[PDB]
Design an enzyme around this catalytic site. Sequence first.
Site, PDB file in Angstrom:
ATOM      1  N   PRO A   1     -18.904  46.784  24.665  1.00  0.00           N
ATOM      2  CA  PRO A   1     -18.679  47.278  23.290  1.00  0.00           C
ATOM      3  C   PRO A   1     -17.396  46.708  22.699  1.00  0.00           C
ATOM      4  O   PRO A   1     -16.501  46.309  23.434  1.00  0.00           O
ATOM      5  CB  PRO A   1     -18.596  48.792  23.388  1.00  0.00           C
ATOM      6  CG  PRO A   1     -19.525  49.052  24.552  1.00  0.00           C
ATOM      7  CD  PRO A   1     -19.227  47.916  25.554  1.00  0.00           C
ATOM      8  N   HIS A   2     -17.314  46.641  21.376  1.00  0.00           N
ATOM      9  CA  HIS A   2     -16.097  46.145  20.732  1.00  0.00           C
ATOM     10  C   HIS A   2     -15.563  47.246  19.837  1.00  0.00           C
ATOM     11  O   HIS A   2     -16.249  47.708  18.942  1.00  0.00           O
ATOM     12  CB  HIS A   2     -16.368  44.894  19.897  1.00  0.00           C
ATOM     13  CG  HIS A   2     -15.171  44.422  19.128  1.00  0.00           C
ATOM     14  ND1 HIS A   2     -14.010  44.010  19.745  1.00  0.00           N
ATOM     15  CD2 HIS A   2     -14.927  44.382  17.796  1.00  0.00           C
ATOM     16  CE1 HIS A   2     -13.097  43.742  18.825  1.00  0.00           C
ATOM     17  NE2 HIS A   2     -13.628  43.962  17.636  1.00  0.00           N
ATOM     18  N   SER A  38     -17.087  44.605  29.780  1.00  0.00           N
ATOM     19  CA  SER A  38     -17.879  44.603  28.544  1.00  0.00           C
ATOM     20  C   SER A  38     -17.073  45.088  27.345  1.00  0.00           C
ATOM     21  O   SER A  38     -17.530  45.000  26.206  1.00  0.00           O
ATOM     22  CB  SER A  38     -19.093  45.531  28.683  1.00  0.00           C
ATOM     23  OG  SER A  38     -19.866  45.260  29.837  1.00  0.00           O
ATOM     24  N   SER A  40     -13.902  45.226  24.629  1.00  0.00           N
ATOM     25  CA  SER A  40     -12.882  44.476  23.906  1.00  0.00           C
ATOM     26  C   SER A  40     -12.367  45.416  22.823  1.00  0.00           C
ATOM     27  O   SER A  40     -13.125  46.214  22.280  1.00  0.00           O
ATOM     28  CB  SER A  40     -13.466  43.198  23.279  1.00  0.00           C
ATOM     29  OG  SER A  40     -14.591  43.485  22.469  1.00  0.00           O
TER      30      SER A  40
END
Lengths: 76, 76
Positions: A1-2, A38, A40
């Site tokens: 996920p960001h 995963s 960021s």
Amino acid sequence: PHIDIKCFPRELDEQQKAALAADITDVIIRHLNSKDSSISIALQQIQPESWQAIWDAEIAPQMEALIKKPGYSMNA
Amino acid sequence: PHIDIKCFPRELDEQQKAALAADITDVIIRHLNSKDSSISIALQQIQPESWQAIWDAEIAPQMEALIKKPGYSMNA
């Protein structure tokens, strides 16, 4: 996920940045079952007088889809 | 501050979205010393097919400035 965090200018050294990063990561892993790799995270500082643009572009447009509505309100 | 969470599609009911928002809120409050009412949170589910766009317009460009770098790379 960001994850993207927009806030008013803050004083944050590299340790404060890492600390903030670690607590967000923790939450993401626990709630979304993500892997650390995963994840960021961006931290963008908006100048003191420029929030109207964030409200018109990010907040207002998704007011209802928001998993957490803004307390305040700035619509004409 | 405004926090935007982008992730791949997953099943999430109202209670889970709330728990996530609540936890994100507490982390923000400690690190940014923000008021609670001033915090808004968005959660956008992005299809894997559209992630590349997110990488190009959000991650890659701010790579060196991310407070948390991703453990993968989409240069290919």
